[PDB]
Design an enzyme around this catalytic site. Structure first.
Site, PDB file in Angstrom:
ATOM      1  N   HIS A  16       0.813  -1.211   0.000  1.00  0.00           N
ATOM      2  CA  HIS A  16       0.000   0.000   0.000  1.00  0.00           C
ATOM      3  C   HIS A  16       0.850   1.265   0.000  1.00  0.00           C
ATOM      4  O   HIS A  16       0.312   2.375  -0.067  1.00  0.00           O
ATOM      5  CB  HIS A  16      -0.937  -0.020   1.214  1.00  0.00           C
ATOM      6  CG  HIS A  16      -2.050   0.976   1.147  1.00  0.00           C
ATOM      7  ND1 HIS A  16      -1.833   2.330   1.002  1.00  0.00           N
ATOM      8  CD2 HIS A  16      -3.392   0.816   1.222  1.00  0.00           C
ATOM      9  CE1 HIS A  16      -2.994   2.960   0.984  1.00  0.00           C
ATOM     10  NE2 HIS A  16      -3.956   2.065   1.115  1.00  0.00           N
TER      11      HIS A  16
ATOM     12  N   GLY B 282       2.131   5.761  10.466  1.00  0.00           N
ATOM     13  CA  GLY B 282       3.522   5.490  10.176  1.00  0.00           C
ATOM     14  C   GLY B 282       4.065   4.211  10.771  1.00  0.00           C
ATOM     15  O   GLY B 282       5.252   3.912  10.571  1.00  0.00           O
TER      16      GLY B 282
ATOM     17  N   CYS C 119       2.946   1.194   9.975  1.00  0.00           N
ATOM     18  CA  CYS C 119       2.846   0.114   9.005  1.00  0.00           C
ATOM     19  C   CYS C 119       4.235  -0.321   8.560  1.00  0.00           C
ATOM     20  O   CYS C 119       5.163   0.488   8.453  1.00  0.00           O
ATOM     21  CB  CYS C 119       2.011   0.550   7.802  1.00  0.00           C
ATOM     22  SG  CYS C 119       0.278   0.912   8.207  1.00  0.00           S
TER      23      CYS C 119
HETATM   24  C1  LIG Z   1      -0.009   2.588   8.690  1.00  0.00           C
HETATM   25  C2  LIG Z   1       0.256   3.491   7.453  1.00  0.00           C
HETATM   26  C3  LIG Z   1       1.670   4.135   7.519  1.00  0.00           C
HETATM   27  O1  LIG Z   1       2.582   3.537   7.980  1.00  0.00           O
HETATM   28  O2  LIG Z   1       1.874   5.455   7.031  1.00  0.00           O
HETATM   29  C4  LIG Z   1       2.143   5.559   5.640  1.00  0.00           C
HETATM   30  C5  LIG Z   1       2.157   7.049   5.242  1.00  0.00           C
HETATM   31  C6  LIG Z   1      -1.421   2.774   9.279  1.00  0.00           C
HETATM   32  C7  LIG Z   1      -1.435   2.227  10.701  1.00  0.00           C
HETATM   33  C8  LIG Z   1      -2.804   2.166  11.227  1.00  0.00           C
HETATM   34  C9  LIG Z   1      -3.369   3.546  11.511  1.00  0.00           C
HETATM   35  C10 LIG Z   1      -3.083   3.805  12.832  1.00  0.00           C
HETATM   36  N1  LIG Z   1      -2.978   2.416  13.581  1.00  0.00           N
HETATM   37  C11 LIG Z   1      -2.818   1.445  12.660  1.00  0.00           C
HETATM   38  O3  LIG Z   1      -2.706   0.289  12.870  1.00  0.00           O
HETATM   39  N2  LIG Z   1      -2.421   2.099   8.422  1.00  0.00           N
HETATM   40  C12 LIG Z   1      -3.332   2.910   7.564  1.00  0.00           C
HETATM   41  O4  LIG Z   1      -3.254   4.091   7.570  1.00  0.00           O
HETATM   42  C13 LIG Z   1      -4.379   2.214   6.670  1.00  0.00           C
HETATM   43  C14 LIG Z   1      -5.754   2.856   6.869  1.00  0.00           C
HETATM   44  C15 LIG Z   1      -6.459   2.297   8.126  1.00  0.00           C
HETATM   45  O5  LIG Z   1      -5.978   1.412   8.751  1.00  0.00           O
HETATM   46  C16 LIG Z   1      -7.790   2.913   8.570  1.00  0.00           C
HETATM   47  N3  LIG Z   1      -8.745   1.843   8.803  1.00  0.00           N
HETATM   48  C17 LIG Z   1      -9.404   1.146   7.691  1.00  0.00           C
HETATM   49  O6  LIG Z   1      -9.185   1.433   6.562  1.00  0.00           O
HETATM   50  C18 LIG Z   1     -10.410   0.017   8.022  1.00  0.00           C
HETATM   51  C19 LIG Z   1     -11.736  -0.008   7.658  1.00  0.00           C
HETATM   52  C20 LIG Z   1     -12.288  -1.163   8.137  1.00  0.00           C
HETATM   53  C21 LIG Z   1     -13.746  -1.632   7.980  1.00  0.00           C
HETATM   54  O7  LIG Z   1     -11.327  -1.840   8.786  1.00  0.00           O
HETATM   55  N4  LIG Z   1     -10.158  -1.096   8.718  1.00  0.00           N
HETATM   56  C22 LIG Z   1      -7.580   3.680   9.870  1.00  0.00           C
HETATM   57  C23 LIG Z   1      -6.458   4.693   9.704  1.00  0.00           C
HETATM   58  C24 LIG Z   1      -8.875   4.413  10.259  1.00  0.00           C
HETATM   59  C25 LIG Z   1      -4.038   2.383   5.192  1.00  0.00           C
HETATM   60  C26 LIG Z   1      -2.587   1.873   4.908  1.00  0.00           C
HETATM   61  C27 LIG Z   1      -1.512   2.855   4.432  1.00  0.00           C
HETATM   62  C28 LIG Z   1      -0.088   2.352   4.148  1.00  0.00           C
HETATM   63  C29 LIG Z   1       0.246   0.868   4.356  1.00  0.00           C
HETATM   64  F1  LIG Z   1       1.505   0.413   4.105  1.00  0.00           F
HETATM   65  C30 LIG Z   1      -0.829  -0.113   4.822  1.00  0.00           C
HETATM   66  C31 LIG Z   1      -2.252   0.390   5.102  1.00  0.00           C
END
Ligand SMILES: *[C@@H](CC(=O)OCC)[C@H](C[C@@H]1CCNC1=O)NC(=O)[C@@H](CC(=O)[C@@H](NC(=O)c1cc(C)on1)C(C)C)Cc1ccc(F)cc1
Ligand SMILES: *[C@@H](CC(=O)OCC)[C@H](C[C@@H]1CCNC1=O)NC(=O)[C@@H](CC(=O)[C@@H](NC(=O)c1cc(C)on1)C(C)C)Cc1ccc(F)cc1
Lengths: 305, 305
Positions: B41, B143, B145
């Protein structure tokens, strides 16, 4: 979101752990620059546990009586001195893995990470808090002495603990890296009483703020109370008294949430008086007191090292 | 004595953590030998974020669109590919700190240590359990992830988890290092329902055995029960059924304490029926279910790595 009992990354300290052997006694040592720090008890000849003559025993033991092993590498001992309850072994090689470090003496209520070690090798890492009675509730077995506790202040490993003993209650006692015990304990099989353990009130409130940040607000009410009205209640339940210094240290969490310190004390007063209603707070049925206000902020911000 | 939520030493993993950046998106990657693994992602935008065609997004990316940095040195991406939800970036430099490692997919109820990182730098370490509904109760911020979870099986770092998302309940979901999610979750902002979670029965019993090893026996009773009778009670309290495989897994703790597994099941049966009597077991007023039987033996016998 989420909140866990989180320990510091242990890599920097892992590189400093070595095995120290004297006679039949083997334990862990901390190798920083060309000095290895370990509990002086390593030189006791069993019978000395009761009334050790460390002055005659250091005179007795040669540098060759000490084996120091950094993994499978034998370190040559060229000097052995004693600083309070810590034995200091000068070795002919400086540890390349030596991180930026400092020796600090922590206060009751402050937390640190412990790297439990045996035979100079790591077994695990967990968070601890210095109790008001200067004990720690750790997890130590035979062979664990010399294991250290530490924080990572920005880029500096601040060593604050070395493990020595286990009391009959199942709690633990040790020294700073200058060899001075926390509390009124001595590294000998003698009579020693730990004071009454009290709950670290300032830390409980910090944890309630962490709960609020992560969306747990069922314990919040519309009431408030004075500093001295809350301590009237706290002192009855062996809770250490809260002062204005603690209120100030909570400001940052007070700000982030909009909840004044004394409004959270009222909610805590309720939990102290009438329990928790079979509900939980951040996954616990008790008032957690081993999270400092700083631990909460750094956990809810993502402070890296 | 003592029992703590104990994480593995994080040194071996800290030396594999790097920072991966594609456009404005920056997260953590795992640098093993000449390949960097991270969540795919990172290639998305927030426009694509919703139900992204990842195969079309990788196609549009080149090697030059990926900036990888190990501490202060920059690695050159010389190839990019995708396996399920994980992105593999071949780099021109092989990591000298690579440990003997294996990619493992863990079962529900098993535990592992999480190295929370941000910008390629570790922030802390803590233990997690793969819940029966294939979520974990972690501590993650923006951040985070790319942070990975692991066990140390003797001489091998077994990587079992890479972090991806947070669900609305405050829980977390991720993949193995092959890029396959644990549970029915997807790395997209689409409807995702975590099943009703259950308590890990076999782990609760292990933690009660740990209590006995550490002297807390107040909850033991002289009764024993059948595996069906216990499971009749368990189902009522949202406990996963107990199987003969779990009974065998608990053999070493039963064998060490002298208390049969079904004897301990009757002690747990009465704790569920009548509660914990306002008392604590190993410092908890709840029944802890994130300690595997191995975790108990690990900490109670002094395993090292
Ligand atoms: C990690 C993304 C990152 O490292 O920054 C990159 C700029 C982040 C961690 C989560 C948010 C805070 N706690 C966590 O575990 N993940 C994300 O931002 C992802 C988006 C989400 O997790 C959202 N939730 C959903 O989408 C969701 C919906 C349902 C029905 O179940 N879950 C929350 C933020 C609200 C997107 C993402 C971005 C980059 C990646 F490498 C992986 C995933
Ligand atoms: C560490 C000893 C070691 O690692 O050396 C191996 C040769 C050990 C830690 C305890 C073992 C059991 N669990 C622990 O945490 N410390 C000791 O063995 C010291 C003796 C004790 O601590 C006993 N407790 C007391 O003496 C006591 C009683 C009271 C009221 O207060 N304290 C425990 C065995 C129960 C002796 C020792 C040996 C070597 C050292 F480097 C330091 C201290």
């Amino acid at each position: 979101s989420g909140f866990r009992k989180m320990a510091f990354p242990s890599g920097k300290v892992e590189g400093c752990m070595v095995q120290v052997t004297c006679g039949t006694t083997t334990l862990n040592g901390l190798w920083l620059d060309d000095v290895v720090y370990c509990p002086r008890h390593v030189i006791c000849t069993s019978e000395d546990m009761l009334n050790p003559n460390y002055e005659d025993l250091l005179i007795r033991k040669s540098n060759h009586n000490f084996l120091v092993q950094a993994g499978n590498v034998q370190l040559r001992v060229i000097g052995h001195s004693m600083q309070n309850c810590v034995l200091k072994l000068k070795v002919d090689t400086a540890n390349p893995k030596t991180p930026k470090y400092k020796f600090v003496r922590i206060q009751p209520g402050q937390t640190f990470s412990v790297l439990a070690c045996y035979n100079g090798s790591p077994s695990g890492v967990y968070q601890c808090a210095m109790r008001p009675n200067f004990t720690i509730k750790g997890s130590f077995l035979n062979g664990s002495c010399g294991s250290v506790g530490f924080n990572i202040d920005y880029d500096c490993v601040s060593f604050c603990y070395m493990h020595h003993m286990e009391l009959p209650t199942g709690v633990h006692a040790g020294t700073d890296l200058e060899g001075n015990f926390y509390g009124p304990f001595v590294d000998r099989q003698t009579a020693q009483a730990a004071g009454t353990d009290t709950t670290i009130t300032v830390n409980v409130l910090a944890w309630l703020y962490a709960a609020v940040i992560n969306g747990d607000r069922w314990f919040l009410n519309r009431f408030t109370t004075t500093l001295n009205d809350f301590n009237l209640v706290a002192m009855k339940y062996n809770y250490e008294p809260l002062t204005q210094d603690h209120v100030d240290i909570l400001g940052p969490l007070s700000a982030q949430t909009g909840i004044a310190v004394l409004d959270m004390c009222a909610s805590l007063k309720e939990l102290l008086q009438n329990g928790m209603n079979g509900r939980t707070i951040l996954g616990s049925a008790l008032l957690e007191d081993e999270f400092t206000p700083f631990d909460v902020v750094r956990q809810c911000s993502g402070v890296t090292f």
